[PDB]
Amino acid sequence: KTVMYTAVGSEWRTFGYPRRRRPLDSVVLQQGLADRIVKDIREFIDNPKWYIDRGIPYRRGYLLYGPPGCGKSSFITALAGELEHSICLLSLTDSSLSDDRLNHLLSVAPQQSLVLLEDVDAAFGRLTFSGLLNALDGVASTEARIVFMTTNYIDRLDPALIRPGRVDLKEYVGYCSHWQLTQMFQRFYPGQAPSLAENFAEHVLKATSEISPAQVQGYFMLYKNDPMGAVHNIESLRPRDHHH
Amino acid sequence: GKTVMYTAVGSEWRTFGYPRRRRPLDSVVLQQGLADRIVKDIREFIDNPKWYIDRGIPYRRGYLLYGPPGCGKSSFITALAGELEHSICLLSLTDSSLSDDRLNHLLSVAPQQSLVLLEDVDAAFGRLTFSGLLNALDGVASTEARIVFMTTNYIDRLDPALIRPGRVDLKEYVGYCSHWQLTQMFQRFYPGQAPSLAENFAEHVLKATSEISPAQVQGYFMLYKNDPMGAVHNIESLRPRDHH
Amino acid sequence: KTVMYTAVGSEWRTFGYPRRRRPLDSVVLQQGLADRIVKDIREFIDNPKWYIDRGIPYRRGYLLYGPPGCGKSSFITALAGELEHSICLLSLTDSSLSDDRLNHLLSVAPQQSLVLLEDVDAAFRLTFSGLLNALDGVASTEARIVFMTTNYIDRLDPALIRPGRVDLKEYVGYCSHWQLTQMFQRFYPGQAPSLAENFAEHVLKATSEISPAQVQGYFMLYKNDPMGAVHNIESLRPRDHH
Amino acid sequence: EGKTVMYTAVGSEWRTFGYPRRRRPLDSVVLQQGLADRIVKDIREFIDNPKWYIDRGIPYRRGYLLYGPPGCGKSSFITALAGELEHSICLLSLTDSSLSDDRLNHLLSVAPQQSLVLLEDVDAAFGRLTFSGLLNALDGVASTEARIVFMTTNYIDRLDPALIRPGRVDLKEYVGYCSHWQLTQMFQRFYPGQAPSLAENFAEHVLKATSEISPAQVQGYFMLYKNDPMGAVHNIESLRPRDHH
Amino acid sequence: EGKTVMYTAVGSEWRTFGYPRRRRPLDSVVLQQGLADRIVKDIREFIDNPKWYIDRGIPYRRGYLLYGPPGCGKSSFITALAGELEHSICLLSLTDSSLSDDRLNHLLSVAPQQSLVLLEDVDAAFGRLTFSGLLNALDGVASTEARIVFMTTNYIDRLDPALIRPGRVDLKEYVGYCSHWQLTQMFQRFYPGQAPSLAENFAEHVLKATSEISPAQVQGYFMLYKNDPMGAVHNIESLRPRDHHH
Amino acid sequence: KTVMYTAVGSEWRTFGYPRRRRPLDSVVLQQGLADRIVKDIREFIDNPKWYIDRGIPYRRGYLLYGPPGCGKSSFITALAGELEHSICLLSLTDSSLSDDRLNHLLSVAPQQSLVLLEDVDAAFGRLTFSGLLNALDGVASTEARIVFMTTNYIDRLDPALIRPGRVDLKEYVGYCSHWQLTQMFQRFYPGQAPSLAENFAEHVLKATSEISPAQVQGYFMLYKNDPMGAVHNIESLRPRDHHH
Amino acid sequence: KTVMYTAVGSEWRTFGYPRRRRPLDSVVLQQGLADRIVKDIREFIDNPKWYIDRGIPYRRGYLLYGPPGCGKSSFITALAGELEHSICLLSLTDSSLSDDRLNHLLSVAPQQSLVLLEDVDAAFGRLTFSGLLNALDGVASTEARIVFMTTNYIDRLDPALIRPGRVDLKEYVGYCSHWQLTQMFQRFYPGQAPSLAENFAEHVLKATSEISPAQVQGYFMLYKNDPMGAVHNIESLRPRDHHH
């Protein structure tokens, strides 16, 4: 299972039921991206002695950035499941949250957890920019701590917030590649000819400029157990205005 | 069968007044095929949890009804709830007590077999933040077996991220009367008249008006109770008239 | 009598004494207007089955709009008396009133009452969407009659007063010839109709617009003096403040 | 013999303010010729004729607006009028933290009987009070009967017409700078038992030395010549307007 | 020997502020010739004539405004005047968190008898106090009798005429920079037993070295020449205005 | 020792330990300035009868003004020590401080104290301008009271705040004269030839346009017991930009 | 170990665990800078008598300024460890912090501690500018007190805040020199030929205009125990845009 924590005052409490792990394979990122992040984070988890020998704070931060519906929240959920880590949901835009409380919350994060700061562009007894920077990477910051940040708008982030030592790895999570379309078709319609996934991908890339994995999921939801339906109705993915 | 309304008191849902008489689905006249398409979609969602769990997809669905005042959004959602024997949870996003924390908890403890209703979601944009809403609707901590309905008169005011697939799965325009809605409404208000008389009413209404809401048609029929010939003879009164 | 209720928190409480009913006849609207509103509201009260058979929310809303002093508040008082209804005074500009409280207040309105929203233009704590959804939304209750007033209908959002929120909109204006003769005959009973005619003709020549409130105020200067009223009409010709 | 009781609002209720006050005699306030008589006649006709109102279905309420420049008789007249009618005065401040629409409605409904409710400087008003709350308290569905309201302002042009329409304000009176008649009347009150010809001399000369003079200025001048009517008549050039240093 | 009691507002009531103070002698405040006598005469005539007011139905109240530049004698005169009349002083701050229209009305109604209510810097005023609340407290239906109010300001042009009309303010006096007469009078008070000719020498030379000089500046100058009248007369060029270091 | 008081509500309380007196001689003001202020304040303390005979409020106020680091706070500390006076630290920018509280605090100041108002330019329930003027010199002001004000910005002070009777003596406290440089050198390096102090002063005034006593102190701190070091490294006092 | 304190009201409390000391050698500043600050601060700690004899307040202040990720927070941590000093974390942007509380907090700082004001540019019932100046260097300031300030933006600081006697030593902490690159390579890859560190430094300075030590650390983290990898992949440090 994957345990979710939320902040209640200065302490972390479980949020609802332990959740079924989303399998990492059920999230289709651009080719090699999932492997690169998993390798990076396993190398961090496996090498505390390398950090302590060199006097380096034993912490790592990740930033996933890009358009809505491309896999940021889903990937972090699946990654937590893959690493048997829990997730601490830390809201930076919150009445009770002070610099003092943030420092304490980061210091008492359950072990084997990812601290998740969603939509960190929207932050900027209340939090200050300097409080956030010094909690993430300052004199009092604690060790064995992994932080994930997300944003739709990396251009809005102050460079100081995401410099190495606060964010160690930045990854763009984008609209579907050819490879993501064939991989997603094969996951939703297992045991079809690879040639049929190819047919689907070629035609989607000709009917669209940009398509999110969320749109691809939503389309396959209209053709449950109907792979030929999925391949025949691709013109419906051509963008269409709202009614005015 | 009745329809139970819930409102939020703190972090919990409480019944709001009496159980209400179900509005029959047939008493709401949407554009041809629209009601059937939404009922089919939502029954397919309710009937297929295993399809979602097998593929690791969050078992949640969101609906947006958009369009001008008086065209059937609130009445359809009431009737739909009745058809599916679902209750309705009335969630006001513009509300002093509602924080990101409370919204997360309220969505997590929604009565089973309920539609969470967010009316006028354009008017939303401690207290609630835009990121808190997006992450409650589709984020790491969002709960399963959850159906959300949103409405707006102004879809052009909504941020794309709020209504992307995975937050909103189906968007439907609910507009001014078609020819078909006029004949269907005439036959419901004046049962056992010749179809030719409903036709006469529809043709003449569409020549006297550029746009007419179902609410206006209802209001007109209210002046001609049990007087179908009255309704057919006084259509020039629907030609728009200034306030004094 | 007519009972007035005001909101205390989420509940309705009586306001002062039960009031003497104002007779409907003592409020003089434009010819046919009062009869049309009474007929409409009695048809609503008498026809719940017509609504339920067709699946229509059993609710009706009224908007009276127009210049100060022409009969909106007085008519609603008299109408309540005529229908043996009470009145619930709901102030939309009020510190304690939230969307939640408004919903609950409309749901526990005493039966056989008119909910009165005076000066509904001045509302736009309560949100616009909260008001619209209380008046006509999923949780709105049945057997409910709402009256709205405004001096400024052009300031109202169309969504607030669309059919299903407001079912009947009526303009309440400055005196017609007919209102002037009817008012003269009520204030000076047992005079020749020709004397009411003399009064009306001369008032319409001395004035561009005159409210019933001004006509009442004028007759108050000539209590039991109908000849005084007919002789001093040039005093109604508009005169600046100093 | 009789006194005038002042009430102020404490929460939703009226309480006495200090001592019962000695009545100012109506004759000690000198308004323009006929004005005091017209207001007294109007208000006595209202007090004496409840049946006329009830028979015709008309709300048994009356409102008065006194308007004009500072120091011309508005507050002093209302004090003297209250004394003449053996009425108390309820001092209602519309600019006040605690005052809501709800509290105003309740305060007007429990006003001591035989009182004038006084709204001084009603131009300066425009939880907390709203314009609609004030209009509906003064003349709306829940307004109470046997109620007399007096409003004052220095600035009638700032008042919304809806606030002072008939049924909220029934009688509007301008209270202005001294007429010839007010000058002779004031001289005769401050210097009783002088020849009318001496009051005439005073009035003619004051109107030649001044464009505008308030009764408050005339009172202030007579205060410099207590028991000295010839002094008052001889020093009128001192009333010619003079800059601040 | 008499003292002067100072009161401040605590809520709706007046309380003594520190010790009873030594009376400043009226003669130790040097106003322009005749000004002090005119104010004393006016205020004694008010105190002595309640019957004249009651017979004519006139509110038994009087208000005074002293206005003009800093350091010319407004606060010191009012202190000395209070002492001369054996009156106490009520210090009423109009710019104050707790002060409402209601509280001001009550405070003016329970002012200790034989007191001057002092509103310093009344230009700076313009729940919480409103303009109408102040006007109606000073002269309105509920205002109380046997009440004397003193207002001061450096800026009379900033006062609304309604605040200072007769019946709120009955006497306005300008308190200005030193006349020739104030300079000779002040020299004779600081250096008793000197020839009038020496006070004359001082005054003539000060008026040639300065455009404007406050009594406060003259006091401050004499403080440099305690018991040294010839020093005072010899160092007058030091009163020629001199910039701050910039 | 010198006792420091701070305001707690309407009353004065001791702040920490009694402090070692800074010797007056250890503060080097422009030639004759210290002597003129000491003479003035001793003349005030010694002459209450002169004030009472003439009816003059027995109060005196002082304003020290000028650039940062030139001796205002250190002089007032040393002066208090020389006169065996305590110091009352009155902050005018303070949430709790009302007109009422300021009046009471000035009236109950410990006897034989200087009331110190630092940075009086920065002031302009809560304090008002009129409250401050009337506390300093008004009807209820108390006697035997000495106030010191400081500012870096005398041009920002309203003339009414610092008129005679509120402020009786204004003194500018400026950048080093030749005399202050030789005096400071002789204090930091006792028992050197006057010629060496001269060498130091001449060269500092050629390398600098403006130098504060604080800068001279800071320089001598780099050359403790090294007077030749001090004389040899003067080019280091030539102004240098920040790395920006 | 190194003990961290944070403010709780008017008093200092330990923050989590005593931390492992960062060795001073693990922080690579520009050549000679570390030695100059250590020498200065040891001279201050060792010479109270020199201060008391001359009447000089026994206090010293330090300002480290420059771009993000160049060694300000790391150096102060390591310096505290080297001097066996604790660190008091004082947040100037904080709801509860008044002028009064700041005065008291500076007066009861644990002995043998550095008071740390991070991001002092961001400060400018509640703290005022004058309150801060008078706490740092005023009549009531306490002795045996060491303050460190940092900023990314020294141009935003008012000169009065950082004048000698408030700040005694200002040091720029910048992007990597040639010397910092060879020193960092030799620390991360001990026992390699100096010639290899040289190869690394020359090539990094040709591929970059500016590189922070934080970026160098981040790069070496990709080549743990792979010095030839570090030397071969330097073109990867050439700046690269975020995906738009």
Ligand SMILES: Nc1ncnc2c1ncn2[C@@H]1O[C@H](COP(=O)(O)OP(=O)(O)NP(=O)(O)O)[C@@H](O)[C@H]1O
């Ligand atoms: N790369 C992906 N592979 C598979 N499913 C995906 C992917 N991206 C999105 N989805 C599906 O689409 C929905 C949204 O995915 P999610 O990861 O929450 O997107 P996101 O990038 O966090 N969006 P946002 O918060 O709006 O910036 C979920 O139901 C996912 O299963």
Ligand SMILES: Nc1ncnc2c1ncn2[C@@H]1O[C@H](COP(=O)(O)OP(=O)(O)NP(=O)(O)O)[C@@H](O)[C@H]1O
């Ligand atoms: N399509 C429809 N079929 C039948 N009745 C309708 C329809 N649309 C509106 N009405 C009637 O008109 C009134 C208002 O309908 P409702 O569904 O509440 O509108 P809405 O679209 O939610 N309006 P709004 O909230 O102002 O955007 C109710 O009395 C309905 O019975």
Ligand SMILES: Nc1ncnc2c1ncn2[C@@H]1O[C@H](COP(=O)(O)OP(=O)(O)NP(=O)(O)O)[C@@H](O)[C@H]1O
């Ligand atoms: N049509 C009318 N017939 C008889 N009396 C009327 C009429 N209109 C107004 N009045 C009288 O004038 C006064 C005001 O009437 P009312 O109905 O309160 O006006 P209104 O339109 O509600 N004014 P307002 O609130 O300013 O928009 C009352 O004293 C009524 O008796």
Ligand SMILES: Nc1ncnc2c1ncn2[C@@H]1O[C@H](COP(=O)(O)OP(=O)(O)NP(=O)(O)O)[C@@H](O)[C@H]1O
């Ligand atoms: N018409 C008048 N007759 C006699 N005395 C008057 C008259 N008008 C003003 N006074 C005197 O002048 C003073 C102010 O009178 P008052 O009636 O309070 O004026 P007002 O018009 O209310 N002034 P304001 O409140 O500034 O608008 C009192 O002392 C009165 O005695």
Ligand SMILES: Nc1ncnc2c1ncn2[C@@H]1O[C@H](COP(=O)(O)OP(=O)(O)NP(=O)(O)O)[C@@H](O)[C@H]1O
């Ligand atoms: N006319 C005067 N005669 C004698 N001393 C005076 C005079 N004016 C001012 N002083 C002295 O200078 C100081 C200020 O006098 P004070 O009466 O407080 O001035 P003010 O006019 O009230 N100033 P301000 O409050 O700033 O407008 C006191 O110490 C007085 O003794």
Ligand SMILES: Nc1ncnc2c1ncn2[C@@H]1O[C@H](COP(=O)(O)OP(=O)(O)NP(=O)(O)O)[C@@H](O)[C@H]1O
């Ligand atoms: N004239 C001086 N003689 C000797 N030391 C001085 C002098 N001026 C300043 N200092 C020293 O420099 C430091 C600050 O002096 P201080 O008196 O606090 O300056 P200030 O003028 O009050 N500065 P500021 O508050 O920024 O306006 C202390 O360490 C003093 O010892």
Ligand SMILES: Nc1ncnc2c1ncn2[C@@H]1O[C@H](COP(=O)(O)OP(=O)(O)NP(=O)(O)O)[C@@H](O)[C@H]1O
């Ligand atoms: N000069 C340096 N030598 C060695 N490691 C360094 C150096 N500068 C930064 N680092 C490393 O990079 C990270 C950040 O260093 P740190 O001292 O916190 O930066 P800073 O200058 O305080 N940054 P900032 O607060 O953003 O202005 C830590 O992981 C350090 O180990």
Ligand SMILES: [Mg+2]
């Ligand atoms: Mg997301």
Ligand SMILES: [Mg+2]
């Ligand atoms: Mg609706």
Ligand SMILES: [Mg+2]
């Ligand atoms: Mg009305």
Ligand SMILES: [Mg+2]
């Ligand atoms: Mg008045």
Ligand SMILES: [Mg+2]
């Ligand atoms: Mg003064």
Ligand SMILES: [Mg+2]
């Ligand atoms: Mg200082």
Ligand SMILES: [Mg+2]
């Ligand atoms: Mg740092």
